[PDB]
Amino acid sequence: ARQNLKSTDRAVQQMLDKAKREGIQTVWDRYEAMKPQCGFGETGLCCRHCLQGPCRINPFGDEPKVGICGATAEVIVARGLDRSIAAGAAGASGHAKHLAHTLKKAVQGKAASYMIKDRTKLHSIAKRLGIPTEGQKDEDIALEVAKAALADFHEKDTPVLWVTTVLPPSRVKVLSAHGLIPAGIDHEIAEIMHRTSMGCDADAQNLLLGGLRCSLADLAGCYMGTDLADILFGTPAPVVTESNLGVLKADAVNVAVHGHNPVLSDIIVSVSKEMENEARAAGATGINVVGICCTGNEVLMRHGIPACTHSVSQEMAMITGALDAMILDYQCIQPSVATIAECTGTTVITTMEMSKITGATHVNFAEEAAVENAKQILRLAIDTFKRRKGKPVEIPNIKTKVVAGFSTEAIINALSKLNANDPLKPLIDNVVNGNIRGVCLFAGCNNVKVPQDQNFTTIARKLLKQNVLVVATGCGAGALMRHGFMDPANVDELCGDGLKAVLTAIGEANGLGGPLPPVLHMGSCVDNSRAVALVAALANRLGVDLDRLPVVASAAEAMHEKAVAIGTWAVTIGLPTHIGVLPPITGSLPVTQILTSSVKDITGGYFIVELDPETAADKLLAAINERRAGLGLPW
Amino acid sequence: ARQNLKSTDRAVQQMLDKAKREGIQTVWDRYEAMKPQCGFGETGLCCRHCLQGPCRINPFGDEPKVGICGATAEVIVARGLDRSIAAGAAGASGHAKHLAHTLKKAVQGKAASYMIKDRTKLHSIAKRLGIPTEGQKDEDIALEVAKAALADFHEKDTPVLWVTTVLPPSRVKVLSAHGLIPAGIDHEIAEIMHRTSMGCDADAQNLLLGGLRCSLADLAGCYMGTDLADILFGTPAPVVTESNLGVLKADAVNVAVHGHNPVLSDIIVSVSKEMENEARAAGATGINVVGICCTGNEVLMRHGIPACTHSVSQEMAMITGALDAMILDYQCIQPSVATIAECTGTTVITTMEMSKITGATHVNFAEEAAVENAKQILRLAIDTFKRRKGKPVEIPNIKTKVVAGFSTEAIINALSKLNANDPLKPLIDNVVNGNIRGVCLFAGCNNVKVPQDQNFTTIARKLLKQNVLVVATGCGAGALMRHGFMDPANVDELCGDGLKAVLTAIGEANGLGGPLPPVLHMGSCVDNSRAVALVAALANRLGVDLDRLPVVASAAEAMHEKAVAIGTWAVTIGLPTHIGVLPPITGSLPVTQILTSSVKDITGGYFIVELDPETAADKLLAAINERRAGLGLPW
Ligand code: SF4
Ligand code: SF4
Ligand code: FES
Ligand code: FES
Ligand SMILES: [Fe+2]
Ligand SMILES: [Fe+2]
């Protein structure tokens, strides 16, 4: 088998060969067994929203042409897309809500493993929300912030403040004029599910406007999640670590944290240190915590925990034979891990009540008992390490160097070394003079349909040569880090001369004797909100709205409903937004035309659907350069 | 074409012949064009929850056997079912929330077309919720009730009170022990959408427990909707009217109200009276308001507005040529009505922001302007009547007599004429002595897969002969009313001797010189909550939980996600619950076993999946008789 057709990651290729000779079925094998996939679902021309279905519509030819109730292709496609947006927003809702409850418990004395670690961020958030801080105790300010977070989930006398206070007034005004500001996060999710049920909304434009509004509920959940996690766990600052499977160590207890909400896995990191001597008593060198997916990104950004792998290739960490435990919260966890565990000697542990996997051990995490829970979990991992005494393992000796931790605060701080009282100005100066052509945010997942990482790296390489400042989150950051795009030693090879000059100037003013890395890692999927903060700050500093800035986004290998929601809010806030896999819209030309063209007249953003990555890079560069021209800049 | 294979309603058959010769496509034609339907969707073995899909699993044979991410058939089936429950609950959320806002506006002086019409119900609801009434103005009590309603949508220091205050403490205790009490209505909807997204919950039992809890969020929305509509519009009492297409009048302006939330259509009824002389100036005899679907049931129950048709046959009202306007809110409206309108000369009008139909005129209803909006709408209808001057119409001269209005308060009042201070006792006496074998609630829709009404009438006939007290809501009530089951003149033919004796005794004590009708119409789909109130009151009076009572439910021709949610909460509160169409569960035996068998050990209720109505009636009778035996009663 030509494993490079499955993944461009050489460590993944090595583990695919091991899985093949050991007869362990992988995600790629399950994909092959699924082909050919249903074309009605692929194009969006299937509806199961009532028990008269399934209804399907032929993309072309003869009947069926319309759903049983009369729903047109337009309506079916838009309703399906809307439910995907609501599902994505629901995951942001759950993640942010859990942190809000954790912060409230911490300051009420109910969860002493948690605390206010970033008091400055707490006060800034409170100020942004309009909560008084002068003369108030930090615990009372934090209680008010947590109450405000919980209030944004339902209707009240204000709209969702984690939208209206984080975008510039001119953008809020555009959105309000179109009725797009969410009334409440869970309120919008429920309204989507209602309006898309049988015999309700049946006008494509009306449906899609509802979807844009629900996507902003996802944005609010993202921003709230980042805000609360920074209060609780610290705002990221620049870190150096490593990525890929070679970060596993045969002689250590290897523990992966996997999922998205790091609420317990930030605790796992701290407790794992305490238990070093206990792990050594078991014959290990220590506990080696490694990251998978967003939870991995969270602890990478804040603590420099090395990232083992991401998204589509997550099973491969287990195939090494050296993964003693995989500690799960929720989201993006292939449930195959529970069955593979029996073959590989990994202990798979679930921790959240609403995310269990048949066959995996469940340990009831509670903030109130977080240290206790962590010790129970890590002792299972130590037990598992002991059971593999004397078993060879196959860890690919493949890893990259990763500089990360570029929160928006960290980026502004780095720029302030060039201009202390106007830190965005050096960035803008270099956009104006062409040393920085524009900004591209890579976001979202890998997808088994695309050879792993191929779109991210192909597009990033062409943008970097054209002097684009590239920022990344989620498993887009994962793809780029595992291929060396976060190692400053690769700036000469990857970057155009103008971009190299800027990364070098900033790095040398931050005492590095060397440049910033080719790509700036801005964190997890909720931390796409950090990219919003940066872009909104640039818009404010320039006095223009986001749809005039040379800033684009690319969900180059999108998979999860979360990625559909993110792409939709990127469009809603004003960005040209590439998606590199086909969303289920091509069965309706009118819906496609709205999402790729006429939405420009509503929000200024628009989708760019392009599966060929070289072509996508050209289209993204054209979008950037069109924005440059609109600002009167050379390009 | 043998139209009796499509509908057992003879008026519908006549209009199907008219549609055929005029070349107007109907729901039945669109169904035929859809056959054969996809077996993966039919069985539940399809997933589109991420962009790696669609994934499908062969019910039997070879690969594919598992989803791409590892999701098993169990997981796929349970996730799909859970999303359907959440969608149903979301419609109850929207409906109830709109009424809560209407009540709040009314008592704040912001919507003078609305008012407190049932002060006694207001005070009783307040007492049930724990809101003080002594010394308080009605407007302040109502503000507190509306605030409490809105609070049940989100988490707070109490669970959802429209669950915990409406079921007996022993039932609440059972549900709480299993973690099934909702934390908030929209909170549960969002948690379902999260947990069912890719890489989250992947254990069938855990998923289905979440679904049971979300179904109780639907129950809360139903009960809240009924409570608030009774405050605003009056609690139903016994009414006499008519049903079927013969209620249309060629010489009148015929206006159908269609959808579910009657917030404007209760106003349409009152304003239509005011405009009699204006309609007469246009050459009509008056404005003839008629009902379709739940909104029709609402105005039938409160005002005796005749019901034109229901559910699957709704297009046939238009085919007569005499329907001048169809006034829509949301839910259960086939969007085909907008295109048929061009053929039939009907003006189709949408009124709610989140439910538009391409090609239909939209009129922006606002409580604040309700009378103004109603006049605008009715003037469009008058204009349309004038355009059909001199056009023949074909109204089938087919109608039945309907006695309805059996709210739980009305039933208790009727029984109190036999026992003033213990009004449930005469009902219980007759259950004990066998004159009443048990109670069956018919609920939910028609479904194009089932010859219209055939399951409702076949099952009802066999239960009535076996002395079952039959109550009905929604388009189950619609089916039964259109076939004479709400006409007391049919008691001799339909009812067993014991049931006849009871209906006669109650009727003769209420001054009727004649029995109650064979079936008691308890209202719209949210008014399934009234059946809960009756059953909970019987449980309380007997000192037993609902899972010991000889009470069953039947969604005999279910269609909408709403009907899936209702069936699931019927099971959750303890009832044997028949469903007469196949829900998408048969692709997983473990899920089927949970829903039809092992849930008995959790809630005491269970699904009975049976597509053959004679067999379903036997299974429902066996369920009733098993409950009788458990109470020590003869059967
Ligand atoms: S909502 Fe309409 S299109 Fe969808 S399954 Fe039901 S009948 Fe078919
Ligand atoms: S969630 Fe799993 S089963 Fe569903 S479409 Fe995605 S890969 Fe397939
Ligand atoms: S027909 Fe294949 S996704 Fe429904
Ligand atoms: S394969 Fe037909 S419903 Fe998906
Ligand atoms: Fe992610
Ligand atoms: Fe209904």
Side-chain angles (χ1 to χ4, degrees), chain A residues 38-42 45-48 54-56, chain B residues 38 41 46 48 54:
Chain A
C38 179
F40 301 101
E42 287 180 328
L45 297 173
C46 178
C47 180
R48 297 169 57 201
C55 290
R56 71 201 179 280
Chain B
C38 179
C46 178
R48 297 169 57 201

Side-chain angles (χ1 to χ4, degrees), chain B residues 177-251:
Chain B
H178 289 287
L180 299 179
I181 296 297
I185 294 166
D186 291 347
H187 169 82
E188 298 300 328
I189 292 162
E191 189 181 61
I192 289 292
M193 295 308 297
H194 181 192
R195 84 192 298 150
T196 58
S197 75
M198 182 276 152
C200 297
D201 207 14
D203 175 77
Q205 180 74 18
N206 203 45
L207 278 158
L208 295 172
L209 291 166
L212 303 185
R213 177 166 67 247
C214 196
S215 81
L216 291 176
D218 180 88
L219 171 58
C222 289
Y223 210 119
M224 187 188 298
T226 301
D227 268 348
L228 296 168
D230 283 354
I231 293 168
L232 284 163
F233 305 121
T235 302
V239 293
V240 187
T241 188
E242 295 179 323
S243 77
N244 213 345
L245 299 182
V247 308
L248 297 163
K249 298 176 194 313
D251 58 0

